[PDB]
């Protein structure tokens, strides 16, 4: 629920890597709320968004919290459809933070 390292088996083919594989790999990523050290700016941003006092900008809406993000990574390795071992560095998260 709060900001934490998460883990799931995913198809290598979903990773968007080009190399084709029939393997699943463990992939780790970061997600969750960063509602703790609540800043004056974020409190007011959240107030204004709640009061609807801000016209929405072009693009993404502003976030009123730090984002749950990875701080460190490890490689992901797998055998591709031709049975060649492949490795991609820094693809999988190993730690998270509120950034």
């Amino acid at each position: 629920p709060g900001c934490r390292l998460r883990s799931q088996l995913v198809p290598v083919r979903a990773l968007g890597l080009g190399h084709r594989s029939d393997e699943l790999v463990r992939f780790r990523f970061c997600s969750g709320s960063c509602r703790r050290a609540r800043s004056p700016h974020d409190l007011s941003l959240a107030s204004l968004l709640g009061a609807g006092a801000l016209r929405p900008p072009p693009g993404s809406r502003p976030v009123s919290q730090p984002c749950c993000r990875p701080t460190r990574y490890e490689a992901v390795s797998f055998m591709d459809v031709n049975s060649t071992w492949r490795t991609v560095d820094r693809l999988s998260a190993t730690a998270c933070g509120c950034l």
Binding site: L9, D22, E23, L24, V25, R26, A75, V76, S77, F78, M79, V81, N82, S83, T84, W85, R86, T87
Partner: protein, 199 residues
């Protein structure tokens, strides 16, 4: 999907096995491969992984015409990285093995447990101790592997060319892998087991 892929995925599902497999996979990947680092990680894999996972990973059964299953089985240890690009004479390989106390130990074990006592496949000890000693050679100077993607024969990466007065001794060493009823039947039995387990 084939049982080689299934057993690879059983390892992935196990946190401890997945970590040991990824580690050699990473060390044995790419054209930039560092052979001695890959070999170290293979030794570690077979040393530390649960025997049923390590045996399932490598000794996995493939249907008659399943080239993809056999190619996977044949490349599981990353032989393009683990094996020297040029195959030396087989006795030289043994010599290099004798020169390293760990390798020397692993070869003695394999010679002890995988000695055939008859044509039926009776081993000097037990089938399961033979398999353990066999996989104990992977990541050493005498790393055995599957020869083909259509059959289950296994061999060292070496030749008996340039052997001279030492031809028979050389072919005898090769024979412990090619013409060994104990080793052959132990691998074939385990593969049958793995088939039947899933079925």
């Amino acid at each position: 999907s084939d049982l080689c892929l299934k057993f690879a995925m059983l390892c992935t599902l196990n946190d401890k096995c997945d970590r040991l497999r990824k580690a050699y996979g990473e060390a044995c990947s790419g054209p930039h491969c560092q052979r001695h680092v890959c070999l170290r990680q293979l030794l570690t894999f077979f040393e530390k992984a649960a025997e049923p996972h390590a045996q399932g990973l490598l000794l996995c059964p493939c249907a008659p015409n399943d080239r993809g299953c056999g190619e996977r089985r044949r490349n599981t240890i990353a032989p393009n990285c683990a094996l020297p690009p040029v195959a030396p004479n087989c006795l030289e390989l043994r010599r290099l093995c004798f020169s390293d106390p760990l390798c020397r130990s692993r070869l003695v074990d394999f010679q002890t447990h995988c000695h055939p006592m008859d044509i039926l496949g009776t081993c000097a000890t037990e089938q399961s101790r033979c398999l353990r000693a066999y996989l104990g050679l992977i990541g050493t100077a005498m790393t055995p592997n599957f020869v083909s993607n259509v059959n289950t024969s296994v061999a060292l990466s070496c030749t008996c060319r340039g052997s001279g007065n030492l031809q028979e001794e050389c072919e005898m060493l090769e024979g412990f892998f090619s013409h060994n009823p104990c080793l052959t039947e132990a691998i074939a039995a385990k593969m049958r087991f793995h088939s039947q387990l899933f079925s």
